[PDB]
Structure 1
Amino acid sequence: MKFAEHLSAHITPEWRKQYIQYEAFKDMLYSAQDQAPTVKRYFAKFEEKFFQTCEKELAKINTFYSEKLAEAQRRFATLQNELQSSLDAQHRNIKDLKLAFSEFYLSLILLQNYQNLNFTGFRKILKKHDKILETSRGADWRVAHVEVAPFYTCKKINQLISETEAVVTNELEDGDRQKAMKRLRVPPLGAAQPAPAWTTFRVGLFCGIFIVLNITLVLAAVFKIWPLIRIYRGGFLLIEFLFLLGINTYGWRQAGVNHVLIFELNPRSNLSHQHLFEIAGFLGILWCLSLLACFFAPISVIPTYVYPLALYGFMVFFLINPTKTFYYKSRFWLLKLLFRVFTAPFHKVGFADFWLADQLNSLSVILMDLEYMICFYSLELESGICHKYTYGVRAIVQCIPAWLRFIQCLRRYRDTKRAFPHLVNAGKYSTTFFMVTFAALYSTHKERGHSDTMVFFYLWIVFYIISSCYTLIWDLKMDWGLFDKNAGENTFLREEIVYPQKAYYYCAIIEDVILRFAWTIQISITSTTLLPHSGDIIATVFAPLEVFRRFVWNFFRLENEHLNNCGEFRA
């Protein structure tokens, strides 16, 4: 029933063009029916055209199946050779070979699903054509040609699957089929797997509680010793980033962007956007409860400062929970990625490391707020000393994410020796160092008149412009790939675009243009004392805008990486 959406959802995105165009055939049949007036000869011509189109589709399917089968056979031969070499050598290598075998099994199951779905679509479309035309020739065509097509009559895929199972059981799992087929089953994949009902209910409950608590917080703030905005901005930004990341995952899944392969995640087990929404909602509930406790201070004995810490500490615990609960696999993966990023020069830079470093570049406000909290606790607990004065440590903390990205680019240059991309990106990140340093120098010299304060102000202005232009150009031309020379119809874009609307691309371009300058202004204001009066308000307003810009950027960067190997993270 309603095979169109079934086909659309169960199609492998990377092979979309190689599947049968069920919607195209439906449109052809409906148009022929509408244009039907000579009637018999017209119907005969339409039948001939439909059969020719079906023959073309069948030939395309057959050739794709043949090439995929040949590739699978070659990969199986290489894997068998590797396994034989490993046996001749006789732990980590065994695990890597097992992962490779799992990937090969997933590819084989994907090919099997492709052929099964193609046959089902052929049968359904021919049945629909027979029903509409009131003729049985469609069934005859299906039986004569489709039923005997090599792609449908070839069981080599099944034999390869069985051989893979036997090899894995005998050699890798030590003769126990129970160990095999677990991690080697390929459960439902893509959008074809509905999210758990309990997960959706939890997501809804958390969003509802978050909304009501936000309404209560606004009402209290309108009707009602410690900087609350500074302390809680980091948590709010983290929750917003998690929610927008869930939206990013949903869009990637809907748009056919194979983010799983790009991020090097397990195709069989993946974190759905619903899980990200659930985590964001729970964290937002905790954040709102802490803020409400701060505003009201229900328990008099417990001091106010316990409420924020108790939240953030819990968050840290939630991230580092040793127990295998609450998304333990994803949490451990995130911990490993964070450790690799913060020790960037000593590890090979994959796509995930660079992406997370960029996210930290966008979320630097959290680190800056942590430094401000440390200063406030150390000194305040001259009034407002941490806010009226700046120092080198503040600038270094601001630049830490840019330092990580710059060192990652240097490591990539060392590994690949390709000057252009990595060195240009390194310069694009060092613009941040220059701008922050000059802003800090100007702020320091403003108090103690050096007679060169205006020189530093001008240098900061030019470096601000340079950094904004550099970042915007890199985002538009390299991260997003837009403004390409191959745009046949998609002006200012590339030749291939996956998202349905180009208006989204144009709006994203405009928002990136505005928000790159906005974020540069926010960094300049926060890292120094440029605007001691309204600096906090502007920074607080701009940080969510920076997160939104970083969300749109993730969308389009993942879309470019999937379409083109812009990051050069894959062979």
Structure 2
Amino acid sequence: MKFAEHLSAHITPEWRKQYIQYEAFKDMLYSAQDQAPSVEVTDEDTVKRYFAKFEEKFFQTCEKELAKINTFYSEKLAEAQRRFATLQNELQSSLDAQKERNIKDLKLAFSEFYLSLILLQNYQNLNFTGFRKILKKHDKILETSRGADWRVAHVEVAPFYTCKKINQLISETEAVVTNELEDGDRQKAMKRLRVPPLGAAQPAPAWTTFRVGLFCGIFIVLNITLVLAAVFKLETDRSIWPLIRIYRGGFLLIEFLFLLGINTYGWRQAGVNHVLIFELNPRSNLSHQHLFEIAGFLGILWCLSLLACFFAPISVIPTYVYPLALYGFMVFFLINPTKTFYYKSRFWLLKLLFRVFTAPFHKVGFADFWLADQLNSLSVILMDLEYMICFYSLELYTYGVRAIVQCIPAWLRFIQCLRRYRDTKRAFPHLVNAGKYSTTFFMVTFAALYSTHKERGHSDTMVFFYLWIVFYIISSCYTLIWDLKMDWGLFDKNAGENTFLREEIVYPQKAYYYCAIIEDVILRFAWTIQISITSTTLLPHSGDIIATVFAPLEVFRRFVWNFFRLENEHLNNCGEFRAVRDISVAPLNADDQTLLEQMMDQDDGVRNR
């Protein structure tokens, strides 16, 4: 029904159940048009009785929808006035206590109340528009002016159209917040109220939370079992290394899903409209509980497979079957053809993976960017899958295959950037980004050549070491600056009070931003050294331990990056993915000063010239 571009994400399904059935009315009109007997075949009486039959049903339906809208609007208006009274009482109680954090929570409550008022204004406007279009179509199709007369007689005098208390409540809320929650300042108060929490007024389904608890408990006890089994049951005269890489890939996947659930929670509460940026379906999206539940389920499977590897559950089944069973079940749960077990999200993810891997052919949305960059962060999973294939194919680095596997994610985003260069034709945010994902290629290639030529012992080995170190520092500095400037939006010249930040800050505290800056610096350097070390056969002592301990750190950096990049996308629209910068919830315009300067003198001026 095309509610809006930003309000659509904040609208609860129970809100959508109370709008006019535009599609149903149009289908009814088209059914009346399609089944109409003709004057040529049937006489006028038969046609007239058919149209009377249709009009009676049509107007009964219109009366029912109008009554529904009136009743729901009355309920929501009463709720809004009651909540405004309660909030004023709380604010006055706080002021009386102080004169003779709760204040931040109270500003948040005012933001949610403002969002409710905007949604009710939307409720008035779109329902009136729907009635007007439906009755205009009725007039066009049946050639009778009964639609317009009925609209004038009933719709235009209905309470939802005429009651203008919502505008007054909006103005009073703005005045209250401006003059009482902050000092005299309207820009700051409107800036705070214009970004309400995206989380609409529905709790968890009350069974997803229970399953999250179930899987968290099983996961905690299984981890304790893993720790005890590893401490006591230790192998002898065998290499546990082939198992640790496989379960490392599994662990990074599970941890990424958990941290992505935390990211969804952070975006939803802070106000970042990730639904619009990701271009998700505004109806039936996933909160953080669902992601936590999926992460817990895969963690249970991973822990069970690892315990089966440590113990000997089934004598006939060998040890290497358990990783096979684990990843077979994971991939089947990813490519399940049926409609069960998160079919919507699973199919969305499959479509997104198809568009990411065949990058230049598909137009680059925001989701393709986000998931290609997540692949840039999670390349260790791809490498461990490659190692699993190698270890299960050759037995139980053919020719630079590992280097290609490392460079696959960087190549995907490199070619996406070039495709966006072809499409948009702007060299600033695209070719620079491509240069970044090519410096990653240079890093990997020179590390591999250094590893190969260290065996030769030729004097060119030091030249390749110098090339590796210079490209290491270049890629680290390049990615760090690009992150903190274009991907995060920090270090802006416009901010005066936020110091080394930008004008608009969504998250409640600033120390988050600073600690994120430091961790992002040290962890980008660690990520680059991890790529270099894992791409080189320098020494197996630190190798396979540096990567193992630094990969979860890399996923940590990536989810922090997720927070701040989505915040930048909401605020400063750093990517040209949508042709509207302003997503923040704002009401319609008000020009009461235009009635002033009129009503008193010779207005005139109605003529064009």
Calculate the TM-score normalised by the size of structure 2.
0.65
Q: Measure how far apart 1:64 and its partner are.
A: 22
After superposition, give the CA deviation of every residue in 1:275-330 in whole Å (9 maximum; x if it has no partner).
00000000000000000000112111100000011001110000000000111011
For 2:105 and 2:358, locate their aligned partners in 1 and report how far apart those are by CA, in whole Å. 24
Q: Secondary structure at the match of 1:344?
A: coil
Q: Measure how far apart 1:451 and its partner are.
A: 2.2
The alpha-carbon distance between structure 1 residues 139 and 337, as it changes in their structure 2 partners (threshold 3 A), is closer
2:250 alignment partner in structure 1: 235
Residue 87 (structure 2) pairs with residue 79 (structure 1): yes
Higher deviation after alignment, 177-186 or 145-154: 177-186
Q: Measure how far apart 1:374 and its partner are.
A: 2.1
After superposition, give the CA deviation of every residue in 1:231-267 in whole Å (9 maximum; x if it has no partner).
1001100000000000000000000000000000111
Q: Measure how far apart 1:527 and its partner are.
A: 1.7
The alpha-carbon distance between structure 1 residues 174 and 132, as it changes in their structure 2 partners (threshold 3 A), is same
For 2:115 and 2:178, locate their aligned partners in 1 and report how far apart those are by CA, in whole Å. 16
The alpha-carbon distance between structure 1 residues 312 and 476, as it changes in their structure 2 partners (threshold 3 A), is same
Contact 1:237 1:363 in 2 (8 A): yes
Contact 1:337 1:352 in 2 (8 A): yes
1:386 alignment partner in structure 2: none
The alpha-carbon distance between structure 1 residues 48 and 533, as it changes in their structure 2 partners (threshold 3 A), is farther
For 2:362 and 2:50, locate their aligned partners in 1 and report how far apart those are by CA, in whole Å. 68
Q: Measure how far apart 1:449 and its partner are.
A: 2.3
Contact 1:255 1:498 in 2 (8 A): yes
1:441 alignment partner in structure 2: 449
Q: Which residue, out of 505, 515, 524, partners 1:516?
A: 524
Higher deviation after alignment, 124-133 or 519-528: 124-133
Q: Measure how far apart 1:391 and its partner are.
A: 3.7
> Gaps (5+ residues) in structure 2?
38-45, 234-239, 580-609
The alpha-carbon distance between structure 1 residues 270 and 24, as it changes in their structure 2 partners (threshold 3 A), is closer
Q: Measure how far apart 1:392 and its partner are.
A: 1.4
Contact 2:196 2:271 in 1 (8 A): no
Higher deviation after alignment, 22-31 or 302-311: 22-31
Contact 1:472 1:512 in 2 (8 A): yes
Q: Measure how far apart 1:106 and its partner are.
A: 14
Higher deviation after alignment, 264-273 or 177-186: 177-186
May I ask how many residue pairs the two structures share in their alignment? 564
Higher deviation after alignment, 502-511 or 41-50: 41-50
The alpha-carbon distance between structure 1 residues 371 and 128, as it changes in their structure 2 partners (threshold 3 A), is closer
For 1:249 and 1:8, locate their aligned partners in 2 and report how far apart those are by CA, in whole Å. 18
Higher deviation after alignment, 74-83 or 521-530: 74-83
Q: Measure how far apart 1:356 and its partner are.
A: 0.2
Contact 2:111 2:196 in 1 (8 A): no
Equivalent residues in 2 for 1:234-273 (5 A)? 234-273=249-288
Q: Measure how far apart 1:228 and its partner are.
A: 1.4
2:341 alignment partner in structure 1: 326
Higher deviation after alignment, 158-167 or 401-410: 158-167
Contact 1:13 1:256 in 2 (8 A): no
Contact 1:109 1:186 in 2 (8 A): no
> Gaps (5+ residues) in structure 1?
382-388
Contact 2:197 2:268 in 1 (8 A): no
Higher deviation after alignment, 430-439 or 100-109: 100-109
For 2:507 and 2:137, locate their aligned partners in 1 and report how far apart those are by CA, in whole Å. 30
Calculate the TM-score normalised by the size of structure 1.
0.69
Identity %: 100
Q: Measure how far apart 1:568 and its partner are.
A: 1.1
Q: Measure how far apart 1:488 and its partner are.
A: 2.2
Q: Measure how far apart 1:567 and its partner are.
A: 1.3
For 1:129 and 1:483, locate their aligned partners in 2 and report how far apart those are by CA, in whole Å. 57
Q: Secondary structure at the match of 1:298?
A: coil
* Structure with greater helix share of residues: 1
For 2:510 and 2:280, locate their aligned partners in 1 and report how far apart those are by CA, in whole Å. 29
For 1:2 and 1:294, locate their aligned partners in 2 and report how far apart those are by CA, in whole Å. 53
The alpha-carbon distance between structure 1 residues 102 and 403, as it changes in their structure 2 partners (threshold 3 A), is farther
For 2:95 and 2:349, locate their aligned partners in 1 and report how far apart those are by CA, in whole Å. 34
Higher deviation after alignment, 140-149 or 359-368: 140-149
Q: Secondary structure at the match of 2:207?
A: helix
After superposition, give the CA deviation of every residue in 1:24-52 in whole Å (9 maximum; x if it has no partner).
99999999999999999999999999999
Contact 1:515 1:549 in 2 (8 A): yes
From the CA coordinates, give the structure whose radius of gyration is larger.
2
The alpha-carbon distance between structure 1 residues 199 and 11, as it changes in their structure 2 partners (threshold 3 A), is closer
Give the superposed CA RMSD. 22.3
Give structure 1 regions of 4+ aligned residues with deviation exceeding 4 angstroms: 1-109, 113-152, 154-189
Equivalent residues in 2 for 1:105-504 (5 A)? 110-112=119-121, 153=162, 190-224=199-233, 227-381=242-396, 391-504=399-512
